């Protein structure tokens, strides 16, 4: 069923800087040692990216920051997440999300990756409940509350069963997952790349090229989206299902794409190592027009 989440600290989000991130491969054609211009939706360089946190600090009162809000979905979005305990379990995409217009769901319930585009009566506050027992050291999940009904459906995909750690790691974030979502001609194109990293509390500085992951022919109208999050329940969190919980430290970043012009550099190994935004500053604009990354 559905339960609302209480004892949370509702606060406005913050902002940070995306240093030349969100670049993905525009086509599946191999190129090497050539500068290739392109005309596609991209994340502009040094753009404002909205910061979200899922962190419950220790102390008497603390800050139970657990942010999974409904966010607008523009022509393109960029998603980045730093994870250590696999808290983010996917997203939901749709228009109204009240079983009036059909919507798609991407949920990783540990064993399988589930893609369903049905008439979902989505919950007000979707979450995934993970329980940590003390009789033994299991970390199973026993709560799955993402939607209320699945009356009419038209698409279904279940991946092969597997397992993950689901461990409450105490150290800093070590896994960086970046995602790019597009909706052109009913094809929900997803670009992703898993990259190891060693940061503390911020988006890392660097460049990365996202490989094409999978193409989803869906054909639905998407105007808003929301992110799913995990939830930890143990003997240190007494109360009912609405208050006896702890967050577990995680964070993610949400940015918006924009129709821009990019100059892409391919090395001798066939990978994108650098990019130039043609509409950022006159220096990079001159580099884009001259088609040279250098200029005398």
């Amino acid at each position, epitope marked *: 069923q559905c339960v609302n989440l209480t004892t949370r600290t509702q606060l406005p989000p913050a902002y940070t800087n995306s240093f030349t991130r969100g670049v993905y491969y525009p086509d599946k054609v191999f190129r090497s040692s050539v500068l290739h211009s392109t005309q596609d939706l991209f994340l502009p360089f040094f753009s404002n990216v909205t910061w979200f946190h899922a962190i419950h600090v220790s102390g*008497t009162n603390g800050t139970k920051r657990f942010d999974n809000p409904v966010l607008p979905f523009n022509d393109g979005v960029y998603f980045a997440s730093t994870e250590k305990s696999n808290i983010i379990r996917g997203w939901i995409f749709g228009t109204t999300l009240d079983s009036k217009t059909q919507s798609l769901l991407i949920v990783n319930n540990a064993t399988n990756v589930v893609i369903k585009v049905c008439e979902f009566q989505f919950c007000n506050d979707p979450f995934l409940g993970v329980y940590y027992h003390k009789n033994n050291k299991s970390w199973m999940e026993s709560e799955f509350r993402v939607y209320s009904s699945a009356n009419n459906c038209t698409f279904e995909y279940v991946s092969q069963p597997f397992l993950m750690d689901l461990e409450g790691k105490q150290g800093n974030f070590k896994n960086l997952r970046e995602f790019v979502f597009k909706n052109i001609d009913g094809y929900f194109k997803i670009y992703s790349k898993h990259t190891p990293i060693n940061l503390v509390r911020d988006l890392p500085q660097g460049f990365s090229a996202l490989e094409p992951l999978v193409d989803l022919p869906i054909g639905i109208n998407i105007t808003r989206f929301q992110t799913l999050l995990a939830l930890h329940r143990s003997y240190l969190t007494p109360g009912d299902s609405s208050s006896g919980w702890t967050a577990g430290a995680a964070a993610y970043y949400v940015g918006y794409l924009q129709p821009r012009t990019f100059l892409l550099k391919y090395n001798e190994n066939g990978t994108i190592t650098d990019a130039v935004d043609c509409a950022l500053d006159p220096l990079s604009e001159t580099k884009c027009t001259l088609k040279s990354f250098t200029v005398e």
Partner: antibody
Amino acid sequence: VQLVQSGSELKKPGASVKVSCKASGYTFTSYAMNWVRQAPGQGLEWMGWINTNTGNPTYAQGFTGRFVFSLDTSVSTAYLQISSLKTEDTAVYYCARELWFGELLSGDFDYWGQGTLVTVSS
Amino acid sequence: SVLTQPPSVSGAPGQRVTISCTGSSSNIGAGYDVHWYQQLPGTAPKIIIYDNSNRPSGVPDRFSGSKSGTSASLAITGLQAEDEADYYCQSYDSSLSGRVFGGGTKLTVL
């Protein structure tokens, strides 16, 4: 992420001194501004913090009135102004970066400035 | 200060030296984390352990620490010549004191 402060000043007792702190490489409105003093050959003292969004200061005990916290978002430079300088105010003042988490602040000072030396003597 | 630190410690190069720390039920016993800072002479302090167990990036593996109820401790393994500095501990007390720093402990390497 750089935290550049002002240079060293030599001031007479009973005067007033202003100390500036430049921050760069990060979104200045996202992190709270903290000020930590240190007497020579002594421990570190925390005289309070000032929010970067609303600009309201929060002084500690014994620092009310004489110490003024202010900033502006055009240049994103924090200001530290001290009035009625006395001999015991001779200390190095450090700027500390803290993430804006809410009404209850954490205890993580990730970045520190180079420090500002002020000496009150005749 | 509310947090109490030993005045100084000494040890041979290469062995293990443990620096202790004690507080009360309002700073460490209340569940707030204890942070540790390292300050070379003439330079700014540098935090080497946060949230009582975790090392930031670039911090060598020789540094380790833990907390046990009211008290907390930090461990040094394999002393060298570059460890000659002053170590400062800090935490969060109640609202009447706020942030409370330690007394400081000079580490001596023979």
